[PDB]
Structures are given as C-alpha cells and as structure tokens.
Design an enzyme around this catalytic site. Structure first.
Site, PDB file in Angstrom:
ATOM      1  N   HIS A  19       0.832  -1.195   0.000  1.00  0.00           N
ATOM      2  CA  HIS A  19       0.000   0.000   0.000  1.00  0.00           C
ATOM      3  C   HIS A  19       0.874   1.256   0.000  1.00  0.00           C
ATOM      4  CE1 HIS A  19      -3.639   2.315   1.637  1.00  0.00           C
ATOM      5  NE2 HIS A  19      -2.647   3.141   1.902  1.00  0.00           N
ATOM      6  N   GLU A  20       1.900   1.291   0.854  1.00  0.00           N
ATOM      7  CA  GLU A  20       2.772   2.466   0.931  1.00  0.00           C
ATOM      8  C   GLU A  20       3.554   2.676  -0.360  1.00  0.00           C
ATOM      9  OE1 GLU A  20       1.801   4.193   3.251  1.00  0.00           O
ATOM     10  OE2 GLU A  20       0.971   2.622   4.584  1.00  0.00           O
TER      11      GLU A  20
ATOM     12  N   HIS B  49       1.560   4.222  -3.104  1.00  0.00           N
ATOM     13  CA  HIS B  49       1.417   5.672  -3.090  1.00  0.00           C
ATOM     14  C   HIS B  49       2.490   6.344  -3.940  1.00  0.00           C
ATOM     15  CE1 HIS B  49      -1.991   6.372  -0.531  1.00  0.00           C
ATOM     16  NE2 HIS B  49      -1.491   5.748   0.523  1.00  0.00           N
TER      17      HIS B  49
ATOM     18  N   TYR C 260      -4.577  14.264  -2.898  1.00  0.00           N
ATOM     19  CA  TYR C 260      -4.930  13.484  -1.702  1.00  0.00           C
ATOM     20  C   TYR C 260      -6.064  14.126  -0.890  1.00  0.00           C
ATOM     21  CZ  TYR C 260      -3.893   9.836   1.759  1.00  0.00           C
ATOM     22  OH  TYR C 260      -3.906   8.768   2.615  1.00  0.00           O
TER      23      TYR C 260
ATOM     24  N   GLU D  94      -6.302   6.262  -2.334  1.00  0.00           N
ATOM     25  CA  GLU D  94      -6.340   5.269  -1.273  1.00  0.00           C
ATOM     26  C   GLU D  94      -6.728   3.889  -1.791  1.00  0.00           C
ATOM     27  OE1 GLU D  94      -5.660   4.620   1.955  1.00  0.00           O
ATOM     28  OE2 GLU D  94      -4.285   6.264   1.443  1.00  0.00           O
TER      29      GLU D  94
ATOM     30  N   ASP E 172     -10.240  13.606   7.697  1.00  0.00           N
ATOM     31  CA  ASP E 172      -9.500  12.624   6.918  1.00  0.00           C
ATOM     32  C   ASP E 172      -9.384  13.073   5.464  1.00  0.00           C
ATOM     33  OD1 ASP E 172      -8.150  10.108   6.316  1.00  0.00           O
ATOM     34  OD2 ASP E 172     -10.122   9.220   5.824  1.00  0.00           O
TER      35      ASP E 172
ATOM     36  N   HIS F 246      -9.750   7.684   3.476  1.00  0.00           N
ATOM     37  CA  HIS F 246      -9.692   6.311   3.975  1.00  0.00           C
ATOM     38  C   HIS F 246     -11.068   5.719   4.265  1.00  0.00           C
ATOM     39  CE1 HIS F 246      -5.643   7.935   5.097  1.00  0.00           C
ATOM     40  NE2 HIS F 246      -5.266   6.742   4.651  1.00  0.00           N
TER      41      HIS F 246
HETATM   42  C1  LIG Z   1      -2.564   0.400   5.206  1.00  0.00           C
HETATM   43  C2  LIG Z   1      -2.636   1.119   6.554  1.00  0.00           C
HETATM   44  C3  LIG Z   1      -2.210   0.175   7.693  1.00  0.00           C
HETATM   45  C4  LIG Z   1      -1.769   2.395   6.572  1.00  0.00           C
HETATM   46  C5  LIG Z   1      -2.332   3.530   5.728  1.00  0.00           C
HETATM   47  N1  LIG Z   1      -1.344   4.603   5.686  1.00  0.00           N
HETATM   48  P1  LIG Z   1      -1.372   5.835   4.583  1.00  0.00           P
HETATM   49  O1  LIG Z   1      -2.717   5.795   3.861  1.00  0.00           O
HETATM   50  O2  LIG Z   1      -0.212   5.788   3.645  1.00  0.00           O
HETATM   51  C6  LIG Z   1      -1.288   7.332   5.612  1.00  0.00           C
HETATM   52  N2  LIG Z   1      -0.806   8.424   4.835  1.00  0.00           N
HETATM   53  C7  LIG Z   1      -1.115   9.709   5.226  1.00  0.00           C
HETATM   54  O3  LIG Z   1      -1.997  10.009   5.999  1.00  0.00           O
HETATM   55  O4  LIG Z   1      -0.487  10.571   4.347  1.00  0.00           O
HETATM   56  C8  LIG Z   1      -0.638  11.995   4.658  1.00  0.00           C
HETATM   57  C9  LIG Z   1       0.648  12.561   4.056  1.00  0.00           C
HETATM   58  C10 LIG Z   1       1.900  12.291   4.654  1.00  0.00           C
HETATM   59  C11 LIG Z   1       3.073  12.815   4.122  1.00  0.00           C
HETATM   60  C12 LIG Z   1       3.034  13.620   2.976  1.00  0.00           C
HETATM   61  C13 LIG Z   1       1.787  13.922   2.414  1.00  0.00           C
HETATM   62  C14 LIG Z   1       0.603  13.388   2.936  1.00  0.00           C
HETATM   63  C15 LIG Z   1      -3.667   3.988   6.297  1.00  0.00           C
HETATM   64  O5  LIG Z   1      -4.738   3.532   5.897  1.00  0.00           O
HETATM   65  N3  LIG Z   1      -3.576   4.907   7.313  1.00  0.00           N
HETATM   66  C16 LIG Z   1      -4.761   5.470   7.960  1.00  0.00           C
HETATM   67  C17 LIG Z   1      -5.270   4.671   9.165  1.00  0.00           C
HETATM   68  C18 LIG Z   1      -4.163   4.306  10.103  1.00  0.00           C
HETATM   69  C19 LIG Z   1      -6.432   5.463   9.883  1.00  0.00           C
HETATM   70  C20 LIG Z   1      -7.083   4.610  10.946  1.00  0.00           C
HETATM   71  C21 LIG Z   1      -7.500   5.946   8.823  1.00  0.00           C
HETATM   72  C22 LIG Z   1      -5.911   6.684  10.617  1.00  0.00           C
HETATM   73 ZN   LIG Z   2      -2.739   5.161   1.998  1.00  0.00          ZN
END
Ligand SMILES: CC(C)C[C@H](NP(=O)(O)CNC(=O)OCc1ccccc1)C(=O)NC[C@@H](C)C(C)(C)C
Ligand SMILES: [Zn+2]
Ligand SMILES: [Ca+2]
Ligand SMILES: [Ca+2]
Ligand SMILES: [Ca+2]
Ligand SMILES: [Ca+2]
Length: 316
Positions: free
Chosen positions: A142-143, A146, A157, A166, A226, A231
């Site tokens: 997933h990461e 991105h 985003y 997402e 969010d 998400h």
């Molecule tokens: C696959 C999963 C285990 C992990 C994934 N990480 P992601 O989608 O990759 C988070 N990414 C994030 O919030 O990015 C913002 C950003 C950061 C840096 C530069 C620009 C933008 C994700 O869904 N996180 C949200 C969960 C933890 C909730 C509960 C919604 C807070």
């Molecule tokens: Zn993500």
C-alpha cells in the site's frame, strides 16, 4: 554504500524466518542490490528525523526484536518491487529503477505508516491498535503504491481523487499479498492490526461496511475529516474492485467476476494511462471501462463486468 552483495537471515514481526539481501562493507547493511538501483532500509531510532541511519548489523543475522520491523520492511519492499516488475513491467515506483527507501521505528507508539514524498515510513504501533506496521505485506505494498500513484496519475490526496488514491493503494496492496500467496485475503492490515482482537482488520474490500466504510456512492462521506474521507470513501472503489475480481450481487446488481489478474491489468492501465490528478469516481469508471476495452475489446465480458461493478456501487 559500496560493498559486496550478501544474504542475511532474520525473523520478521510475526516471528517468521526469511532471507534478506544485504551489503557487506565493514558492517552488513540492509541494502538489497539485486533489485533496480537498490532497496535501502533505515533506522529512525524512535525519532521523527528522516531517513535516519542506513541499517547496520555486525553479523548478518537479524533475530533481535528490534530488527523485526526492518526485516519485514526490507523483504516486503522486495516482493512489491518484484510484483510491479514481473506483472506490470514497471521498474520501481518511477519506472526507471529509483532506489526504494524505507525507515522503521519512526516516532513512539506510532499507529500509522506513510509515503512522505520521497520514502516509506513505518511506525511501531502502540501494541494495542497496531504492532509494527511493516509486518503486513499489504501495508508495505500500500505504501509503495502511493509512490507509484504520485509518479503516474498524481491523484490529489483529498475528496474523490484522494479516495481513488487510497483505493489504488489497497487494491495493489491486496494484489501483492495474493502474489506472495501467504494467507491472502481481501482485508487490509489484518496481520498488524489489533493484536488482542482476532479476525478483524483495518478495512475490508469484500465488505467495507463491516468497519463502517461505505459500499455505495449514496453512503459516501461528505465532511472534511480525513482529507474529505480518503480512507472512508475508498470503500466504494474497493468494493467495485472486489466485485470485478470475485463477482457477487450487491444491492441487487449482479457482477460476473473476471479474476484478480485482469483486475490488476485494468486498474494498472487506468492508473498509468487515463487517470489524472483531479479524477473523480465517475472519471475512474470511464478510465476502467476504456482500459478494459483496450485490453479485452468493447464486446468483452471484462468490459461488461467493469460496468456492472460500478453500477453496483452507484457510480455512473
Ligand atoms: C494500510 C494502513 C495500515 C496504513 C495507511 N497509511 P497511509 O494511507 O499511507 C497514511 N498516509 C497519510 O496520511 O499521508 C498523509 C501525508 C503524509 C506525508 C506527505 C503527504 C501526505 C492507512 O490507511 N492509514 C490510515 C489509518 C491508520 C487510519 C485509521 C484511517 C488513521
Ligand atoms: Zn494510503
Ligand atoms: Ca545481528
Ligand atoms: Ca492476509
Ligand atoms: Ca490483507
Ligand atoms: Ca486484530
């Protein structure tokens, strides 16, 4: 670093032994030279300054508890690289074999993982909501996805484009999990989420509503939390992708499944040839229909199934 390619052995977050590609020069480093221009894994040492230090180990054995998140971030980045190269003929996230960098042990109790514009970053979790997040192959993929999105469609985003962003990461995270073929499922994050609760996951693609996420456009979130629900509203697209692959009847609309490989081909083509930074859900439907038409023909079952799946989730 300059050195010679070596093969270490260690244990991941879940306790499983695996071999890892390392580089020897005084120390053994988490630097895999076998893929592209390298995969590099760093220690953030519980702090937030990135990337931290390239992971160094005296003996090429990675069985300490502190090592486990690094083992898995490094190894699962390799699996994800292999998926994109072998399945989609894509060389790393930029298509030109960019070096892949990840940091583990980010911050303290950190219940998330992310791509920061330049690298992957993994928290250790707080031991309650998450254990170290690189223990999930779907999470790692997933990461890295991105980064693929950012180099290709560039989906902004927030709001619908961000929910597509997402969903693309959950879709390819799941397809990488199936590629590796260890306990694969259509759930997201189950291997690292809530160690005290069995049988749950962070999101479900097969039934997003199990965790409160919408499974139909008429249930989309319209607020500002969010980033406008990126998400949350991903559930609508995740459900469509699940139906394309696996089939089903959803809100009375029947979808003939075409399987995971064709799902991946359709969505990879949509991501790389049709989507743009501002694409909305309706534009994703059109991109997927056009992609399936290119690959399989306008009269194909694959095109018909894409249309049925988007109909089932209320996206015209
Ligand atoms: C696959 C999963 C285990 C992990 C994934 N990480 P992601 O989608 O990759 C988070 N990414 C994030 O919030 O990015 C913002 C950003 C950061 C840096 C530069 C620009 C933008 C994700 O869904 N996180 C949200 C969960 C933890 C909730 C509960 C919604 C807070
Ligand atoms: Zn993500
Ligand atoms: Ca060691
Ligand atoms: Ca699984
Ligand atoms: Ca999974
Ligand atoms: Ca759990």
């Amino acid at each position: 670093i300059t050195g010679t390619s070596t093969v270490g052995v260690g244990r991941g977050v879940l306790g499983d032994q695996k071999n890892i590609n390392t580089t020897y020069s005084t120390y053994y480093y988490l630097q895999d030279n076998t893929r592209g221009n390298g995969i590099f894994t760093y220690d953030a040492k519980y702090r937030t300054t990135l990337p931290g230090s390239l992971w160094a180990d005296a003996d090429n054995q990675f069985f300490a508890s502190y090592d486990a998140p690094a083992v898995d971030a490094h190894y699962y980045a390799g699996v994800t690289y292999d998926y994109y190269k072998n399945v989609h003929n894509r060389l790393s996230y930029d298509g030109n074999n960019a070096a892949i960098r990840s940091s583990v042990h980010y911050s303290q109790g950190y219940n998330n993982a992310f791509w920061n514009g330049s690298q992957m970053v993994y928290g250790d979790g707080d031991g309650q909501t998450f254990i170290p997040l690189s223990g999930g192959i779907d999470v790692v993929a997933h990461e890295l996805t991105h980064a693929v999105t950012d180099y290709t469609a560039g989906l902004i985003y927030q709001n619908e484009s961000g929910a597509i962003n997402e969903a693309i990461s959950d879709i390819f995270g799941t397809l990488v999990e199936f590629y590796a073929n260890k306990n694969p499922d259509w759930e997201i994050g189950e291997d690292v989420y809530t160690p005290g609760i069995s049988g749950d996951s962070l999101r479900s693609m097969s039934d997003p509503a199990k965790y409160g996420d919408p499974d139909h456009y008429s249930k989309r979130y319209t607020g500002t939390q969010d980033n406008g629900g990126v998400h949350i509203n991903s559930g609508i697209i995740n459900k469509a992708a699940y139906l394309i692959s696996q089939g089903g009847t959803h809100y009375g609309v029947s979808v003939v499944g075409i399987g995971r490989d064709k799902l991946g081909k359709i969505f990879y083509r949509a991501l790389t040839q049709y989507l743009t930074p501002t694409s909305n859900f309706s534009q994703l439907r059109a991109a997927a229909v056009q992609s399936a038409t290119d690959l399989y023909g306008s009269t194909s079952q694959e095109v018909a199934s894409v249309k049925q799946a988007f109909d089932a989730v209320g996206v015209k």
